[PDB]
Each structure stands twice: as structure tokens, then as C-alpha cells.
């Protein structure tokens, strides 16, 4: 496989090949107090 740059500016580069995902916690559970799955949420 080959990924070598021909042009001067990075805008000429091809698409990024690092397509992963990350933990959605900052969106799905942005709370201060931890609420474990095994526990009741409101105590």
C-alpha cells in the first residue's frame, strides 16, 4: 500500500484514513453524579 504526499499544502492531501468512533458519554450521559447500571438512578 502507498500513502505519500506530492503537493506542498496539506489541503491537497487525500481523505483521512482514520475512521473510528469514540465513547458517546459526553452526549449520552453528561451528568455529575455517576449512576451505575445496576443501581437505581434517583436515590
Amino acid at each position: 500500500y502507498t500513502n505519500i504526499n506530492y503537493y506542498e499544502n496539506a489541503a491537497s492531501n487525500s481523505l483521512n484514513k482514520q475512521d473510528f468512533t469514540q465513547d458517546p458519554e459526553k452526549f449520552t450521559r453528561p451528568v455529575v453524579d455517576v449512576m451505575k447500571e445496576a443501581a437505581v438512578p434517583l436515590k
Binding site: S12, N16, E25, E37, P41
Partner: protein, 270 residues
């Protein structure tokens, strides 16, 4: 800050679980009021088996979602010239995609497809030379086909032919800002309380493209389509997606509606 974001390349496996008869563990009980999404997992609601899941997550990355050309402009010359303001609100598809993020930084690949058409809009097999000049704000804009501005000693120009493959150039992240904004709850200038200056990020406007035919066509005209492809995408703060039709090219104005999906007879009939 407080919540960390780990990185992964495959969706989560399923591991074998067993039955549970207890008063200490109640994973099914939740409280949506907190602002949190349920955290009850498969393994806790039913007895599961082991499943080594290798399904990938690549095609939903910002780069895989945004990384492909889409139409942003289409027009014909009138007198061998045409001036288009660089803005992506004319065509709704790529527009609705960009508005899924609040802020974003990205480079772009512009592909230009041109061909000659007669007065009745019927394509002609005619190879003619054309020029595309990027005129930043503050630079003198050409009045017509042969004005002096097409000397283009500083402004970038691309000259190709309708018989050559489509033209294409890459463009860097050019805003004065640290990211482009796709939602802006503010005004364009100080001392203006007018609705006509609301919701426009002026730093998102970097000029215009002026197209011409190097020499005059006799009875025909240049038909141009500009495609744009985001590259190296970086985005922040995902937004609630567009659920109503676009009306204006420059603003998000819309017409209220009372439902999104079509109705059905009974809530108990699937």
C-alpha cells in the same frame, strides 16, 4: 474535562449472561429526567450468548459521511460571463448535511464540469476554452467578458477546456474564524437590530467565482456545474437535523407544520 472519550474500531461484542433473581441489581430501572440516556445493556435484560462482533464503524465517521462530491452551483453565462457568490444554500442536499454540525473545519476539493449549450438548452459538441477566477472581497469584479481584471496577476484563475477532463483544485480552510459556523444566533454588524442582518456568519463568505469564455461563442453559451467535496473533516456540537423544507438560500426560514410523519388510523395498529 470530566467525561472521557475512548476510541474504538468495531462495535461492542455480546457476552453470555445468565438469569437473575435479586433486589440489589435493577438495571432496567431508569430516570430520563436526569438528562442521561438509559444504560441498561443487552446482557442485563435477557439471557444472551457470546457474539464476537466485528462489524466496523468506518462509514459513519465524519470523513466517510462528508467525504464525497456534491452539487453546490449550476448556471449559464449571459454575455460570456457569470458571477456566482460562493455560498452553499442554493442546493439542499449538501446543505442539509453540513448543518448536522454546529462548528466544523475542513479543506475542499472543487470539481468544475462545463459544456456548451445553444439557446434551446440542447448540448453542443463544441470544445471552447473557459476561465474561472476567484475574486476575494475587496478585489475589483469583472463587468464583462473582456475587462482588464481577467489578466488575473494576483487572483487565482483556472483555465481549461470543455473537451478536457473536468477541472479540479483543492482549497484550504480559509475562514478568519477557527471553524465555520452552520448556526449563528447573532447579527452581522453592530448597531443593526434588523431582521435582514440576523443569522448570517459573514466570515463564511470568502468571495465569488466569475466565469467567462476566453473568446466569444456565436449563439451558444457555457453551462457550468460546480461540485464540492469536504476533506479532512473536524466537527463539534452535533445539531438537531433539519425536519422542514428550505425556502431561502441565505437563511433557515421555514414554514411550520403539525406533524412530521404521516398519520395512521390507530395507535394500536402497527
Amino acid at each position: 474535562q470530566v467525561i472521557k472519550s475512548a476510541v474504538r474500531s468495531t462495535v461492542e461484542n455480546t457476552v453470555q449472561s445468565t438469569h437473575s433473581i435479586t433486589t440489589e441489581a435493577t438495571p432496567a430501572l431508569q430516570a430520563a429526567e436526569t438528562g442521561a440516556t438509559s444504560n441498561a445493556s443487552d446482557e442485563s435484560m435477557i439471557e444472551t450468548r457470546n457474539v464476537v462482533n466485528t462489524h466496523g464503524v468506518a462509514e459513519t465517521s465524519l470523513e466517510a459521511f462528508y467525504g464525497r462530491a456534491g452539487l453546490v452551483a449550476m448556471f449559464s453565462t449571459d454575455g460570456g460571463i457569470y458571477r456566482w457568490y460562493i455560498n452553499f444554500g442554493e442546493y439542499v442536499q449538501l446543505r442539509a448535511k453540513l448543518e448536522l454540525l454546529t462548528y466544523a473545519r475542513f479543506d475542499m476539493e472543487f470539481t468544475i464540469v462545463a459544456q456548451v449549450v445553444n439557446a434551446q438548452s440542447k448540448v453542443q459538441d463544441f470544445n471552447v476554452d473557459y476561465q474561472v477566477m476567484f475574486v476575494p472581497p475587496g478585489a475589483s469584479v469583472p463587468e464583462n467578458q473582456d475587462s482588464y481584471q481577467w489578466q488575473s496577476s494576483c487572483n487565482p484563475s483556472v483555465i481549461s477546456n470543455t473537451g478536457l477532463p473536468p477541472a479540479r483544485v483543492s482549497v484550504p480552510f480559509m475562514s478568519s474564524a477557527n471553524a465555520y459556523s452552520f448556526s449563528y444566533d447573532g447579527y452581522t454588524q453592530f448597531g443593526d437590530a434588523s431582521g435582514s442582518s440576523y443569522g448570517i456568519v459573514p466570515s463564511n463568505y470568502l468571495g465569488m467565482l466569475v466565469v467567462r469564455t476566453c473568446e466569444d461563442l456565436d449563439g451558444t453559451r457555457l453551462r457550468v456545474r460546480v461540485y464540492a467535496k469536504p476533506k479532512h473533516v473536524k466537527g463539534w456540537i452535533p445539531r438537531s437535523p433539519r425536519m422542514t423544507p428550505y425556502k431561502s438560500r441565505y437563511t433557515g426560514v421555514y414554514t411550520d407544520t403539525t406533524k412530521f410523519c404521516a398519520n395512521r388510523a390507530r395507535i394500536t395498529t402497527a
